[PDB]
Design a protein around this ligand. Structure first.
Ligand code: FAD
Ligand code: FAD
Ligand code: FAD
Lengths: 590, 590, 590
């Protein structure tokens, strides 16, 4: 032993924590650190992006997709501030990530020098750790603790690092990594008393429903078995569709806007809700559970117990173990009018969606684009979804199973999350098929980074929806506003831009050309090319399932007529009809 | 059912969470809320203090002493800002507490009105929850969540509440409490693989030492049994003395300044350290573990694993269970030179302390005041200790056991924590003997609140050390400075002030009068009186155990001579002598 | 030249800026700096307080009273946080002040060491400068800039200083003071076009009124001359009474609660308002100007123009110059019914106040305490007023002139501002009579610092109002609440406490004893003693002039009867009567 460069010590620490990829853009305030990358057999790699926000989002999405702890860097000042959308997303999603903010050298601090400023206030509100390194020798210790904190506190750990520190040398015995001491709690078994109370309520309920969030990830088969055992339909969240087999007989979808018709009707007619591993944000403001009688909640976070609705039964512990315990103790239900009515309601919805997806000719709609994806995607495909209307509606069409991964920016909802997500995913799974589904608005905030996929040979399939408008925003102008719309722009040739970036571009605007174009796009991706499919679609909006104008006791004939005509929903049948057909009555309608 | 006042709903929620005591000062920006207190059979009580900081600290100390969740209020502006020292203490100690900041009515917000301001920035840095209520109807929900968060996140939950909101009425079905869903994780068993690794290291160590922090609270007997089984001396932290029987043969005390001579010598000679449930803050900066060979850590917080020193073995889980598992698996050690040497070193230290405590006549020193306390205190006495030098040194004298509770402001170290601590303690244990041990400086920041104990008939014994100087500060002027001192003030008659406040005052300055005065003070307290014992002591400083000038191989004869003379330590023997007497050699000296 | 200690360099810089007094409490994290005080012929002195908040408030009040730039220090952690109320007051009042936050040495930063923490977030929201010194050598530069910024930006400049920096030595040519370059703008003349527009409106107004704030400080004689010239009554603000001769024929007082009856009636009947140098905070929320027709504003701050009400005429520049220009150009008014009616209304109010102040026997009321002060105070007496109801009402009784200074915490309104104010005032004017007028609640938050006046031989007269209740708070429980009150405490002997602190205490509870007690108190103060007059007054509340129940067209006979009986206001006459007597009619009543 002898001496070691502080920058190298930092890289050794990062590698010990599994943080082998740093995302960002090189700069003078970060050079000393980056210069240590590699050599001494270090395995930390640098992935250079075009905009630091994409680097931050990529580092975060890497973890969302099950990858290693990500690290993102931003040069002192503007580079650091550019990380904001990625860090806010991580903070709200409780995703570990280490953000390193470069800074002018120590001697320049507080001198009002060029691009010199106090960056401590920048992320203090959202960070789980936020410190300005005070002297070179403690940099290794703080990077180690930043990783430890990001992981333990499930959030953003931020370090402001003066650019001269990494150049300093220290004794090899003056630093260490605590990665070897990394420990995590194994799934914890729920209290028998709480499981028992839940079992009693479920046994005595006439209309049970399972509302499963990502806390049930990895336990879809068990949840489906419980659903079948007690004849309780399943409602999922916008983040948890992959947990279920897309064609599961009792899957009603999700509630509210980015949801399905069945789920939205089921929740208003349910009696007992098993809220498993969810923190559904629309709960209170949209009155999701306004008609429920009993509410059972399962969660590993005590801060969540009884948060979204009063909980008659609270179960603290792992959702897997809890579901298994409930499954073993609850009584089996052979026949149920409630179950039968729900199955028919779901089937009716699937008929509608299938009809839209399988059209043969005409102006392209996003429905058929999703159909093409289903017909050509690998069974274990990864989906990086952006936040627009046409992209979030993907959960109504993608035929996913737990073999897939579907991730977005679900709560903070930052636009432009797709491309960075694709980078994080492909970096983690180089041999796996990765799709980025993006709307024109979101694409326009991040398409310069398509070149990043090209440069690093991380081939992804970019599916871009171009409608010259904004469906999502076109939905918030007919529910609170009164004046005319106004969200129509020009016609940018994204395929041409892709070609200019070294990617392969395709343009499609007809349903009859979609299958061929998708096949060619997939084949090109398999040849190692990043592709951009510019889908010139119509201005059609996904049917608003939060405002179902189908029940003749809730809306007028004219309203139902116009609703059916606009969304091609002539064959959709209101849930009450299915309930009454099985001898039941609506608990709230009339 | 029908309607309910929002303020009353808030009180019902607080009571459901066990928060039956609100500390603060009445004001117009808090009146609507306080007006709901009581009535409708509500049991929430208000304890009015003289300075809001005492209310905040009292609410926090209430929890430190094992009481219910505390609530502290501060009027918009100055009342709210006055809570700062109490909230910072809670934040750093990870103590749950709900702080309600009053505010001018909604209509005045952002108008630059009188005593109107944005208070959201005030505590955002330290809070686990920090929100400004946006409308009256959600106040109940936010107070409920504030309690849930404070407890779940072990910290400060802050709510800024416009003064007009509590006056509003809502439907009784428009609010609920999630207190019924409160759940906490039971002690979690450690991984067998980690316990086994620890057992191997302890079995093969020639000089094992147990360093126990408050994570071992409630398991002192087991820790003492392990110490005896493997012949490993025990070192404790400044916060964890009550966990051990004060006279335990192998208790070496704590390290650094507020510690004992034995512990400070033991840690520099130890080979293997079992760091159980501690986050000792002096670890790195004072090089506490600079000579240790192996380090084993037990903690329930993964963020702490390997934080204070590289951990060769990391055990995640409850300290109780871990200690029990280690105790059952480790080999018993019959004889140990290391153990024998430590026992003699401890005995030598106890001879010194006993000699100081048992003096019969002369100018009063804090040593004899502590002696008097030991001779008259109840076996289950509660001690609220302030942060000065003469008060923290109490851990060298108080003969405590797990039947006692000793609490202070250990990390943030805010002065004036004693009186508030006494309030929180007496509020929780009305029939228990409570002592506030305070230095003149700290007392001077909080003595107006002695009247609070008087007014609410919460009798406590205030022991005040008056030396016209500041021992603690008189220690940081001979280790980094060079110029003369200068910390001598006047002679305020605290006994007279106490009498003026309705309390009983005593003044003592001679060792031969101490026992009688203490007896009278205790008897007065048992008659329901709050007492203030103004102890006029000498300027003697507690022997500096962080700089032991006793070993002739570490310091010169003249230094050792002067050291022994100044601290009356002629009979103290350096640990190396005891080591060599048992056939061992110092691992670092020479 | 050669070398110099950084701490000494800092003191030389402070002295060059006139900052010769540092307020605070000594501590290890501040010792290196304080050790440099004095020697090398430096004139910076240290004034040690009992609670750091008093040190902060004293440093701030020093400037409010026309003294030099104040400096306040707070030890790392709790000492620093204790400064908050003083700093918020300075921030809201736009008063320059330098706050130095001590900190653990550089090597301990970010190590989670004892009493070690990031203090940058603490005051970032309110500071005009807030930096953590990055290395020793730049400390002098930053202290110099802190002073420059505090003064130039009229606010709080904060520096966090690691305790090891001041010990470092630098070359004497490596530091400098920019105090020699201190420059301030002289009064700026207003635009002739704006003065002319104002002159036209005033000339054509039938009911002009001058509303003067502290922007008119130093120009009272001119304002009174303008009032007489155009026959426009004068309304002042709670901060600006000293600007006028207390007995000025046309002084109506101030509006709202801490005001007089005349002003409150005048503003609702006025047509044109000359709003000179004011930022009256109650303007919008209390509808102060709801009946005004024209509004003219004069201010040196463009941010204030049109802030409190739409401005028909805006004058940017010095109030003195503007008043002089208006005075020279406006037409003289010989007779005015509006003026005559106002003079009678004012006289009627003065009859009432005089009657209360001159009672001869009975239970003491604050009215007679103020009478005694008027009869014994020096013509140039300085008044440090706290924020309670009985103390703010002093503007209804004190017979002040520009020779006096009256200061409080007017906007942030922190309780306990009086004692610190007295310290700042006496430090600045050692040979001047200084009075601290305090309510029992405020006194209880700061009385331990009475000893500070004693210790430093800065004799002040503390007048304490003890009513066992809280008048102010007793006013916000009968305008928004509904339930019973509840603000009665014990009876603390403040005179006895004062004696215990080395001060001279007096107790008085009868009107017939007030003059003698005051005479003795003043004589004692002239003998160099700090005094505390414990005035045991009744629970009588100052008449609520914001809710004048006197006009038979605004309130019922029973209401007027009860109002007159409760406040001994049988002889008060509603302004409308005086208006009609002069041939005028109310513009809003009926
Ligand atoms: C534009 C846009 C529109 C959207 N529209 C909708 C919509 O209409 N409908 C919809 O549903 N969503 C929608 N979303 C997504 C939505 O905002 C939420 O992010 C999502 O519903 C949250 O899902 P969740 O409850 O599964 O998980 P989270 O909110 O992440 O909460 C998961 C919960 O599971 C708990 N948990 C974790 N692990 C375990 C375990 N092992 N055992 C037990 N509990 C565990 C956690 O503590 C947590 O409480 C939309 C998002 C965007 C960006
Ligand atoms: C003026 C002053 C001087 C001081 N001087 C000294 C001094 O000289 N020496 C000294 O030792 N102290 C001193 N202190 C106190 C010192 O600052 C620390 O607060 C104290 O040592 C921390 O003790 P701790 O490690 O027991 O607990 P904490 O710092 O509170 O840490 C406890 C640890 O236990 C873990 N834990 C909690 N529950 C469990 C469980 N069930 N199982 C396992 N782990 C668990 C926690 O996660 C945490 O990591 C002083 C304080 C003041 C104010
Ligand atoms: C408990 C309590 C109760 C109170 N009750 C009342 C009450 O009932 N009534 C009341 O009136 N006050 C009351 N106050 C005081 C009140 O809150 C305000 O602080 C005060 O009225 C502000 O007075 P101001 O407008 O003179 O000065 P400021 O608010 O300080 O504004 C002065 C203005 O003058 C300008 N200025 C400065 N220098 C010049 C110059 N040379 N030329 C031109 N313009 C200049 C400034 O830019 C500024 O806009 C109370 C305070 C407390 C603590």
């Amino acid at each position: 032993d002898n001496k070691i460069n502080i920058g190298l010590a930092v890289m050794k620490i990062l590698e010990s924590w599994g943080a082998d990829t740093i995302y960002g853009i090189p700069s003078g305030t970060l050079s000393s650190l980056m210069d240590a990358m590699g050599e001494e057999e270090n395995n930390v790699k640098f992935l250079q992006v075009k905009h630091e926000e994409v680097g931050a989002m990529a580092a975060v999405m890497q973890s969302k997709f099950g990858g290693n702890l990500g690290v993102t860097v931003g040069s002192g000042g503007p580079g650091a501030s550019h990380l904001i959308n990625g860090l806010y997303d991580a903070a709200m999603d409780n995703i570990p990530v280490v953000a390193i903010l470069g800074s002018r050298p120590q001697r320049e601090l507080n001198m009002d020098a060029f691009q010199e400023l106090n960056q401590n206030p920048m992320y203090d509100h959202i960070a789980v750790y936020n410190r300005r390194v005070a002297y070179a020798e403690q940099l290794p210790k703080l990077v180690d603790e930043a990783a430890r904190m990001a992981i333990a506190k499930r959030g953003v750990a931020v370090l402001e690092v003066p650019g001269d520190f990494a150049k300093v040398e220290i004794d090899n015995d003056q630093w260490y990594s605590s990665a070897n001491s990394l420990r995590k709690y194994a799934p914890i078994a729920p209290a028998a008393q709480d499981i028992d109370a839940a079992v009693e309520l479920l046994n005595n309920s006439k209309r049970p429903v399972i509302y499963a969030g990502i806390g049930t990830m990895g336990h879809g088969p068990a949840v489906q078995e419980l659903a079948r055992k007690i004849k309780a339909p399943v409602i999922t969240t916008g983040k948890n569709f992959e947990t279920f087999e897309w064609d599961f007989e009792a899957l009603t979808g999700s509630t509210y806007r980015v949801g399905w018709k069945p789920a939205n009707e089921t929740i208003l007619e349910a009696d007992t809700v098993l809220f498993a591993g969810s923190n559904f944000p629309f709960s209170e403001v949209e009155g999701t559970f306004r008609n429920v009688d009993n509410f059972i909640q399962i969660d590993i976070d005590p801060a969540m117990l009884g948060k979204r609705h009063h909980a008659d039964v609270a179960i603290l512990g792992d959702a897997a173990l809890a579901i298994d315990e409930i499954l073993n103790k609850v009584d089996a239900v052979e026949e149920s009018a409630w179950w039968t009515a729900n199955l028919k309601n779901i089937a009716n919805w699937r008929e509608y969606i299938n009809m839209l997806e399988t059209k043969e000719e005409g102006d392209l709609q996003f429905y058929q684009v999703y159909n093409a994806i289903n017909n050509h995607a690998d069974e274990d495909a990864i989906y990086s979804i952006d936040v627009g209307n046409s992209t979030q509606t993907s959960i109504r069409h993608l035929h996913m199973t737990p073999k897939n991964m579907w991730r977005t920016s679900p709560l903070f909802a930052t636009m432009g999350i797709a491309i960075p997500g694709g980078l994080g995913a492909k970096n983690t799974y180089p041999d796996r098929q990765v799709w980025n589904i993006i709307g024109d608005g979101a694409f326009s905030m991040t398409y310069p980074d398509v070149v990043t996929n090209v440069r690093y040979n991380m081939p992804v399939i970019n599916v871009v929806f171009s409608n010259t408008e904004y469906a999502f925003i076109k939905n918030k102008y007919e529910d609170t506003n009164k004046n005319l719309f106004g969200v129509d722009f020009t016609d940018v040739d994204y395929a041409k831009i892709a070609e200019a970036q070294g990617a392969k571009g395709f343009t499609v605007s007809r349903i009859e050309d979609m299958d061929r174009v998708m096949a060619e796009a997939v084949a090109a991706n398999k040849a190692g090319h990043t592709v951009v499919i510019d889908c010139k679609i119509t201005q059609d909006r996904p049917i608003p399932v939060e405002t179902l104008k189908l029940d003749s006791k809730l809306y007028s004939e004219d309203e139902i007529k116009a609703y059916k005509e606009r969304y091609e929903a002539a064959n959709l049948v209101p849930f009450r009809e299915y309930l009454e057909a099985e001898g039941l009555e609506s608990k709230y309608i009339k």
